[PDB]
Amino acid sequence: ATNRDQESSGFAWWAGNARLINLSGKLLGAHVAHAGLIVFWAGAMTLFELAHFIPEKPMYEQGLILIPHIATLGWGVGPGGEVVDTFPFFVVGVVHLISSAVLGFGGVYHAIRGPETLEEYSSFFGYDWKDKNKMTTILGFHLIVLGIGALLLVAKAMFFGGLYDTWAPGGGDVRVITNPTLDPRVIFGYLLKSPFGGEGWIVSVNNLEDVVGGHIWIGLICIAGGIWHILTTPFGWARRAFIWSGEAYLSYSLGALSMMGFIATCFVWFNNTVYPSEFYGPTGPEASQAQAMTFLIRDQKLGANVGSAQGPTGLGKYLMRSPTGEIIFGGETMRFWDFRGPWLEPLRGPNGLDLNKIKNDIQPWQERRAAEYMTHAPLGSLNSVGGVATEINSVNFVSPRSWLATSHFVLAFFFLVGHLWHAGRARAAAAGFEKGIDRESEPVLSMPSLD
Amino acid sequence: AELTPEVLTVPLNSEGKTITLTEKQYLEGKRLFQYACASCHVGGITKTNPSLDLRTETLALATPPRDNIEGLVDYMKNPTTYDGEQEIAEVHPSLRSADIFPKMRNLTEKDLVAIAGHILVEPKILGDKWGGGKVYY
Amino acid sequence: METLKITVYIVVTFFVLLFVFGFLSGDPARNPKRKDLE
Amino acid sequence: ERGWFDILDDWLKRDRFVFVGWSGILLFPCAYLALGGWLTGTTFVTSWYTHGLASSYLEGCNFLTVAVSTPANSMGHSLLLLWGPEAQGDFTRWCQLGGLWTFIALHGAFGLIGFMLRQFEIARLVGVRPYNAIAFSAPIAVFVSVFLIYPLGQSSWFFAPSFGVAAIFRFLLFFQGFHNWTLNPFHMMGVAGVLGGALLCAIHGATVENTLFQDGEGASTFRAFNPTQAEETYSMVTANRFWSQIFGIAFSNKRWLHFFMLFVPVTGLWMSAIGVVGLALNLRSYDFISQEIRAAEDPEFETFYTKNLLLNEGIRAWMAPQDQPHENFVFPEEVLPRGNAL
Amino acid sequence: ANLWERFCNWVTSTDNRLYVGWFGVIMIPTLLAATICFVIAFIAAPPVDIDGIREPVSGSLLYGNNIITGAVVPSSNAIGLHFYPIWEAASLDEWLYNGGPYQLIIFHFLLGASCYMGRQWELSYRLGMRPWICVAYSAPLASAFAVFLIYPIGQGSFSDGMPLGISGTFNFMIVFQAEHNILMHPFHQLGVAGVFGGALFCAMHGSLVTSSLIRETTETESANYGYKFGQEEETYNIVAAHGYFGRLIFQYASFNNSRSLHFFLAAWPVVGVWFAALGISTMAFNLNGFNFNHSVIDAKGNVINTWADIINRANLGMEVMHERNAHNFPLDLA
Amino acid sequence: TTGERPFSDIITSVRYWVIHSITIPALFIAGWLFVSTGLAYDVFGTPRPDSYYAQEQRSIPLVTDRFEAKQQVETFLEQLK
Numbered sequence A: 001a002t003n004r005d006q007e008s009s010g011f012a013w014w015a016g017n018a019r020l021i022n023l024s025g026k027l028l029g030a031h032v033a034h035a036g037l038i039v040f041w042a043g044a045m046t047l048f049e050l051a052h053f054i055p056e057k058p059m060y061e062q063g064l065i066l067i068p069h070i071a072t073l074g075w076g077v078g079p080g081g082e083v084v085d086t087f088p089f090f091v092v093g094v095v096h097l098i099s100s101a102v103l104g105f106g107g108v109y110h111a112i113r114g115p116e117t118l119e120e121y122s123s124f125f126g127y128d129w130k131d132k133n134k135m136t137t138i139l140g141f142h143l144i145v146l147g148i149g150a151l152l153l154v155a156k157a158m159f160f161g162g163l164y165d166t167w168a169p170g171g172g173d174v175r176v177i178t179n180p181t182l183d184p185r186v187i188f189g190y191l192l193k194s195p196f197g198g199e200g201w202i203v204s205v206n207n208l209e210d211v212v213g214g215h216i217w218i219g220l221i222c223i224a225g226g227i228w229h230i231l232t233t234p235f236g237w238a239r240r241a242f243i244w245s246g247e248a249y250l251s252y253s254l255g256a257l258s259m260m261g262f263i264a265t266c267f268v269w270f271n272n273t274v275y276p277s278e279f280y281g282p283t284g285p286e287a288s289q290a291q292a293m294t295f296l297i298r299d300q301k302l303g304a305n306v307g308s309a310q311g312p313t314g315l316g317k318y319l320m321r322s323p324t325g326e327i328i329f330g331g332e333t334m335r336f337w338d339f340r341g342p343w344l345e346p347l348r349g350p351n352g353l354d355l356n357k358i359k360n361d362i363q364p365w366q367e368r369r370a371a372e373y374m375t376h377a378p379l380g381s382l383n384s385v386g387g388v389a390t391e392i393n394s395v396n397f398v399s400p401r402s403w404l405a406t407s408h409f410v411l412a413f414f415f416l417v418g419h420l421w422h423a424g425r426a427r428a429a430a431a432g433f434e435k436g437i438d439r440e441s442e443p444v445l446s447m448p449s450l451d
Numbered sequence B: 001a002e003l004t005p006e007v008l009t010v011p012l013n014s015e016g017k018t019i020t021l022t023e024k025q026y027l028e029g030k031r032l033f034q035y036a037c038a039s040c041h042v043g044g045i046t047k048t049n050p051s052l053d054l055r056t057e058t059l060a061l062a063t064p065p066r067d068n069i070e071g072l073v074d075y076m077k078n079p080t081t082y083d084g085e086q087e088i089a090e091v092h093p094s095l096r097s098a099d100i101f102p103k104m105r106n107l108t109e110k111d112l113v114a115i116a117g118h119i120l121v122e123p124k125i126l127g128d129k130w131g132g133g134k135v136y137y
Numbered sequence C: 001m002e003t004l005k006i007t008v009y010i011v012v013t014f015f016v017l018l019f020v021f022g023f024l025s026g027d028p029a030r031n032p033k034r035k036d037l038e
Numbered sequence D: 001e002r003g004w005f006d007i008l009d010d011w012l013k014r015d016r017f018v019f020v021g022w023s024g025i026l027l028f029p030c031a032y033l034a035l036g037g038w039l040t041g042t043t044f045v046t047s048w049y050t051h052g053l054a055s056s057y058l059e060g061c062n063f064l065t066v067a068v069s070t071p072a073n074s075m076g077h078s079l080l081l082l083w084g085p086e087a088q089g090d091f092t093r094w095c096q097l098g099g100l101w102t103f104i105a106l107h108g109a110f111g112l113i114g115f116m117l118r119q120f121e122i123a124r125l126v127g128v129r130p131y132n133a134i135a136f137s138a139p140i141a142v143f144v145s146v147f148l149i150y151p152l153g154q155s156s157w158f159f160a161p162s163f164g165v166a167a168i169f170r171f172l173l174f175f176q177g178f179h180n181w182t183l184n185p186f187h188m189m190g191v192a193g194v195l196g197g198a199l200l201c202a203i204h205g206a207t208v209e210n211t212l213f214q215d216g217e218g219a220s221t222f223r224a225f226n227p228t229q230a231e232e233t234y235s236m237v238t239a240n241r242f243w244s245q246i247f248g249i250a251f252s253n254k255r256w257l258h259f260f261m262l263f264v265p266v267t268g269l270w271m272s273a274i275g276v277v278g279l280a281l282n283l284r285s286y287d288f289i290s291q292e293i294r295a296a297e298d299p300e301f302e303t304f305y306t307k308n309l310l311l312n313e314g315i316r317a318w319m320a321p322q323d324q325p326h327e328n329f330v331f332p333e334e335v336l337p338r339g340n341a342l
Numbered sequence E: 001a002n003l004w005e006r007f008c009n010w011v012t013s014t015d016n017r018l019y020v021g022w023f024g025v026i027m028i029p030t031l032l033a034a035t036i037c038f039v040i041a042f043i044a045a046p047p048v049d050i051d052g053i054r055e056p057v058s059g060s061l062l063y064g065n066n067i068i069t070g071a072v073v074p075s076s077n078a079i080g081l082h083f084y085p086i087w088e089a090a091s092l093d094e095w096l097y098n099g100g101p102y103q104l105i106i107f108h109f110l111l112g113a114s115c116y117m118g119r120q121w122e123l124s125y126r127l128g129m130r131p132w133i134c135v136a137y138s139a140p141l142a143s144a145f146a147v148f149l150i151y152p153i154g155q156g157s158f159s160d161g162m163p164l165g166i167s168g169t170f171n172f173m174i175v176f177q178a179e180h181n182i183l184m185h186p187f188h189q190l191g192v193a194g195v196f197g198g199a200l201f202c203a204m205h206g207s208l209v210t211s212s213l214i215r216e217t218t219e220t221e222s223a224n225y226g227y228k229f230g231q232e233e234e235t236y237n238i239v240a241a242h243g244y245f246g247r248l249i250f251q252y253a254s255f256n257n258s259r260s261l262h263f264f265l266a267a268w269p270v271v272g273v274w275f276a277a278l279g280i281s282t283m284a285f286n287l288n289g290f291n292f293n294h295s296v297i298d299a300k301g302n303v304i305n306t307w308a309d310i311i312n313r314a315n316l317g318m319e320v321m322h323e324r325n326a327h328n329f330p331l332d333l334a
Numbered sequence F: 001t002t003g004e005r006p007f008s009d010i011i012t013s014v015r016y017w018v019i020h021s022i023t024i025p026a027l028f029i030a031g032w033l034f035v036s037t038g039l040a041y042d043v044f045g046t047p048r049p050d051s052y053y054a055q056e057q058r059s060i061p062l063v064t065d066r067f068e069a070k071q072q073v074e075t076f077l078e079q080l081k
């Protein structure tokens, strides 16, 4: 029982995985078995989603989060996002499920059967946390892998069917991306946009050419930096700035994951391009704009001049100006005038919503799309009663956007706490006082009093 | 109080013929109404146009009358405005427009009768709550 | 307004640089026990 | 003199797994009956005849919506004894009339007295000072003021809180709509006492855990402590310097620190109890007269104070008919206050 | 000893009466800016059109407010989530009308308070302490982020952020109940357990330690003079305290390890307030409390009201009256 | 220790489980039957799903007198046909 109790290892059972820090062979097993769990869930959850899936209902009425991801990549769907073939959903699930057994097999072998340490067995697979050259080499391998992964999305977009394009002329369709954006002013200009309203940082990417071209840049960058980190060792300024330990490296990754989880939370809440509303339901801004559109249409059909209808506040009842003059929907949805969506842009002129188009060019499919999104607003209870908090039972609905955003804010938050926990502990362990103050060497007793 | 055959007896047509639903039809009507209609009609109101509700008195004064099974089944095939002057299948779910309202694709004739029956029975149970909105919640 | 904008931009940049260079300046060694951290 | 009294004393004070004591004669039956009444009521008993509400698992309620509800308003402040003139010894009628509510409230009150006598009794046998009992006066002041004095000032037990999760939530919202209780400075002091109590709890525990002396070799620091050791397990000097430089001031006296921890939450609860005593009589902090005079005369004057009264007015009009069924409120749709569209 | 190293050694010096540190370099200017604007705005700012409907709310003392009703009023709903620094306004008068001050205060405060948390980590490193006091502060800090930043993001407007004032806070709470049924959300319920429990354990630990103080003084003097700052020996008898409390409940419901007792005092309120913070942060994306409206139905189909339905009646009253001039369409979707 | 037998001793002893493999399910089944026979309804006076209202009424049988409350409930119970 090497390091498998508190006396030998120093770690109680409730911190028992800390006993693995210098047991690279068992640590390998833990990581591989855990990836098996991830791949298992992906595989099994897809199959569950497929078994429970009725193609005639919108995905967002059915509690689906994985099938919408597959459909966005262009598999299984045709024009308007209608499901034409559920077989790709089946394949994706089965293959992930079968692979989890391979990973689970490796994980269990390395965890309990193989060598506990790898350094005696292989100097290639062996590592010391303090070896800055080896750690950046392992880092470089995984950057190259990530870069290949980013290029697989490009290959799917350009050579293997394309991607679902909610903005495609004619209501949305799978489209092959032939000219991805490569101009680095466009790709990197997203990185320098303000994150506030009307700008939205990278969350605002709104066309597939930019999505694909950005993954080309990311793939190259990851492959280059991966080669760079195989061939180099950390520079002196870098050496002096960081803590070089297992727990320190864990803490940096925890910080990075937390940040990504927060970005993903906003992506799914605001973006309707890589999270198409056909599959995920309308965004919050989208459903609110759709209500204004619905009652503009209803009242205009009854004979109202919506352009000149003064509401109770003095602002237009249907239409008003944004603080920079653009013609926008009125009422409380004035806050959402930054929303852009395919069902609304045909009414947009240079100055915003165009009154002549509103009067003459509103098509029945737009009235349909606004009424559907207004009645599938991402509001609902924890027991999945759809609607405002005061609504009665009847509609079993919580938007996927709500499920995906709340879960990932919660995870990102705890991963920020985990970063603080492990970064603070890594610093203290490195300096040698993570177990308490030395009584005979208490630093504050050697310092001058404050007053 | 109990869900009795009296409760489940509703007008079949405008001429005064009634039909008596089974409890199974009523409960099937409720489930199918939830599946296909409640996103806009929960509680008997109409979220996208609150001026029109599913109260029986409101359905009686529609053109043609909709306060009976045949009028309601016909509405789900070929919906009209309240005065009958216009056909609104392009914006209201119906069998005629099952291509653009895909949830209507797997509704059979028997399903339309059960949905219709639910709409006609619920006010007899709920009174003012049906089509009353939040004031009666 | 434009003068206010440049002043704030310069002020903020100033303090951010102090923060970044400050933590780049051998901070792990600024502890009361082990200095030799590199 | 070693008579029966002293022999009895001997047995009650035996060191056993559950100490009993003289206080235990009051404490144990009363606590047990209060708890068993609450479980019996929430599992099996309705509120149909007193409130028009279902309130038990038997009826389909869940852990959040079950309650032992208060008696009907027409019972006034009746003790509602099982053998009294309302139920007349009929156990089933008693349950339907709300007899379980006074049963729980009254056995609970005497249970609480018995718990506090237990704190005194054990403290005297062990030889410690009775500050735990003194601190327990604050939960007793809360229970007595909210569950007894408040309804005794009102028309009947009906307006006391009902014993349930969602029923207590209704009590919170009633207190906003009718009493504007968030505005009351006695509630404010109670909020300060409770949030400052939670703060002190967090900050003291964290400070100790992060100024520990290294008294062992393990990475789990819990083992390096011995209950009979003479030394402090953490550094008061380092803790004092940390907080003086982080926050400006710090504790330096460990006895003061722990008295303060007693003092803050206990005082807060006592202050909130005083305000509820006022609400027994509707002696509210509802309004600022100066604001009302200005706002009556100046229809452009708006504050968050006037915005909240509009919310209270919504609460009263929209919840009163269902929440007070004995009053027979019929409010036609046209009289209900509502904003535009909603 | 060059000038940069001199400056770094002063910044990180453990001899300053108040520790500065690198986090303090960001903390001090942002907290000063937020404090100065808050004080000035609270006293003298003119009314603010919070909901974008040309209906300005008076928040300052000079415009008819007292300490209880006063607030710094959130920025205009017309602005939504747009960034509104002073230099984006045509004039200060424009900036004040639209609630400019609110944005300046909360962005500087959130920056400064995050750096306050880093500063707590930083000083613990300089003094040779264990590092996790800042993890306890992350609980109130996350709550501030929830009501000032996260909730506005999910709802699309800083005009639904928490006001900077006492009655403004109550307004925020009441509308929150109407729109998310927060009382019925388990994360708020865990938060209440966190702070009720934290207050209970605060009084608990205070009373038990005070009950077992070792006699070191006479009756005419404060018992606090029986403890001396820096003394080596414990000032109370934990064995007597554990002997009392173990008999109050039973022996195994009582702590006799001061370290795990104090860890429990740390963990219980911090975890509870994390959940409260996460309640607000997830109701920000409209995943609301439990809805049992009309959950109980009789054999005929009559609605049988529960206490949940009575809560709903109260919520409807708040819903229909809040922001009475701000809605033109029947659903309040944000 | 206070002299009683340790709990861990007791609940790992075959004799404990011989006794309680009977007494626990026996009590569970007793609770089940208390509901399934409908006896719970009648002990506590709780309405069944079909006895909240009369077939056409929609008014609550709310108690409105203090000293005739018992008779009021009995009258409400008659009127259920």
Ligand code: CLA
Pocket: A002, A003, A004, A005, A012, A013, A014, A015, A016, A017, A018, A019, A020, A023, A026, A027, A029, A030, A031, A033, A034, A101, A104, A105, A108, A111, A112
């Ligand atoms: C993803 C979760 C995860 C993973 C991958 C690991 C992995 C590991 N843990 Mg950790 N641990 C975890 C969660 C996890 N743990 C949790 C939640 C706790 C708190 C309870 C701990 C507390 C803990 C302690 C206290 C210790 C470990 C230890 C270990 C290591 C050796 C375990 C051993 O020897 O078991 C032996 C047990 C068995 C052989 C029994 C069955 C185990 C197998 C693997 C079950 C697999 C079943 C599966 C269905 C088979 C699939 C086969 C198929 C693919 C063909 C191993 C790398 C030990 C260590 O660090 O050693 C140095 C150690 O002392 N863990």
Ligand code: CLA
Pocket: A013, A014, A015, A016, A017, A018, A250, A254, A414, A415, A416, A417, A418, A419, A421, A422, A425
């Ligand atoms: C990739 C992420 C990651 C990894 C690899 C580690 C790894 C480690 N952590 Mg860290 N940690 C993390 C993220 C991570 N952590 C996060 C996000 C937090 C914030 C909560 C923490 C907070 C934390 C603390 C406070 C501590 C550690 C510790 C450790 C060490 C021992 C861990 C252990 O054995 O736990 C064993 C696992 C358990 C005892 C089980 C926990 C059960 C959880 C709480 C249940 C969660 C509920 C679940 C999500 C849903 C409900 C399920 C239910 C219905 C069945 C180990 C090096 C310890 C350490 O410092 O050692 C050096 C330590 O004290 N971690």
Ligand code: CLA
Pocket: A041, A045, A048, A049, A052, A062, A063, A064, A065, A382, A384, A400, A403, A404, A407, A410, A414, E271
């Ligand atoms: C990324 C995470 C994620 C998200 C966003 C979803 C989202 C969804 N799931 Mg999926 N699922 C997940 C992970 C996720 N799931 C996992 C890990 C499993 C395996 C257990 C499943 C297995 C699963 C099944 C079997 C089903 C779903 C279903 C659904 C839908 C309804 C959810 C619901 O009603 O929950 C109810 C809400 C809860 C149970 C709340 C959970 C509260 C947890 C315990 C709090 C944890 C807090 C934190 C993690 C712990 C911190 C502790 C602290 C000390 C540090 C919704 C689309 C349903 C569906 O509609 O399928 C079509 C369905 O039937 N999911």
Ligand code: CLA
Pocket: A028, A032, A102, A103, A105, A106, A107, A109, A110, A114, A115, A118, A121, A122, A125
């Ligand atoms: C990242 C995961 C990972 C890593 C770093 C290792 C590393 C190691 N394994 Mg382990 N193992 C793993 C996962 C991993 N394994 C998995 C998934 C399984 C189940 C198949 C195993 C089952 C296993 C057994 C049974 C044994 C090892 C052994 C070893 C050691 C020698 C391996 C060698 O020399 O191969 C040389 C390299 C090759 C043969 C090239 C293999 C190329 C693969 C098979 C094709 C796919 C490549 C491509 C990148 C895969 C993409 C996968 C991705 C989609 C997830 C080495 C320490 C040996 C050992 O421990 O000795 C005592 C040993 O006997 N492994």
Ligand code: CLA
Pocket: A136, A139, A143, A191, A192, A221, A222, A224, A225, A226, A228, A229, A232, A233, A234, A235, A238, C020
């Ligand atoms: C997982 C990805 C990853 C990781 C963990 C590392 C890790 C490392 N890199 Mg490598 N690198 C990578 C990918 C990665 N790299 C890629 C893809 C490339 C190709 C572009 C490189 C090219 C590269 C070079 C040329 C160098 C490194 C170096 C290093 C080392 C110093 C890191 C450092 O000081 O950052 C700290 C970050 C900074 C100092 C940036 C400036 C500080 C700004 C102001 C912070 C801004 C934060 C703000 C919130 C940004 C938000 C988003 C923004 C874009 C708007 C460290 C071991 C250094 C080294 O030692 O090489 C041997 C070095 O010289 N890397």
Ligand SMILES: CC1=C(/C=C/C(C)=C/C=C/C(C)=C/C=C/C=C(C)/C=C/C=C(C)/C=C/C2=C(C)CCCC2(C)C)C(C)(C)CCC1
Pocket: A029, A030, A033, A034, A036, A037, A040, A094, A097, A098, A100, A101, A103, A104, A105, A107, A108, A111
């Ligand atoms: C180390 C360790 C651990 C962990 C472990 C783990 C984590 C493992 C994993 C594992 C895994 C991860 C496993 C897996 C497996 C899998 C499998 C075994 C699969 C199978 C499949 C199948 C058989 C399929 C089938 C099918 C088909 C094909 C079609 C469709 C339908 C169906 C589904 C039927 C613990 C914590 C315990 C502790 C101790 C140590």
Ligand SMILES: CC1=C(/C=C/C(C)=C/C=C/C(C)=C/C=C/C=C(C)/C=C/C=C(C)/C=C/C2=C(C)CCCC2(C)C)C(C)(C)CCC1
Pocket: A186, A187, A188, A190, A191, A202, A205, A210, A211, A212, A214, A215, A217, A218, A241, C019, C020, C021, C023, C024
């Ligand atoms: C894909 C895609 C795209 C693109 C993207 C990109 C291109 C990205 C990039 C990105 C990046 C490029 C990022 C970066 C990041 C960075 C970071 C995150 C950093 C950090 C840093 C740190 C953290 C540091 C720290 C420190 C200090 C400050 C002092 C000294 C010490 C230390 C070092 C600690 C787009 C949008 C177009 C479209 C969609 C898709």
Ligand SMILES: CC1=C(/C=C/C(C)=C/C=C/C(C)=C/C=C/C=C(C)/C=C/C=C(C)/C=C/C2=C(C)CCCC2(C)C)C(C)(C)CCC1
Pocket: D032, D033, D035, D036, D037, D038, D039, D040
């Ligand atoms: C009232 C009254 C009385 C009494 C009675 C009694 C005393 C009863 C008792 C009763 C009881 C004594 C009952 C109990 C019950 C219990 C239960 C019902 C429980 C349940 C539980 C559960 C369900 C659990 C859950 C959980 C939690 C809470 C957390 C942890 C985890 C779990 C999930 C497990 C007499 C005859 C004198 C007279 C007349 C009146």
Ligand SMILES: CCCCCCCCCCCCO[C@@H]1O[C@H](CO)[C@@H](O[C@H]2O[C@H](CO)[C@@H](O)[C@H](O)[C@H]2O)[C@H](O)[C@H]1O
Pocket: A236, A237, A240, C020, C024, C025, C026, C027, E004, E005, E008
């Ligand atoms: C927008 C942000 C840009 C970030 C740029 C990142 C580029 C990285 C290059 C950093 C430059 C290296 O230069 C860095 O600064 C000065 C050089 O005088 C040194 O500064 C420090 O040195 C030592 C560290 O041991 C300290 O004790 C000393 O107080 C201080 O002078 C750093 O140790 C060195 O690492």
Ligand SMILES: [Ca+2]
Pocket: A132, A133, A134, A135, A136, A137, A229, A230, A231, A232, A233
């Ligand atoms: Ca290398």
Ligand SMILES: [Cl-]
Pocket: D307, E171, E175, E321, E322, E323, E324
């Ligand atoms: Cl309001």
Ligand SMILES: [Cl-]
Pocket: A330, A331, A332, A333, E326, E327, E328, E329
């Ligand atoms: Cl509106």
Ligand SMILES: [Fe+2]
Pocket: D204, D258, E205, E209, E262
């Ligand atoms: Fe203490």
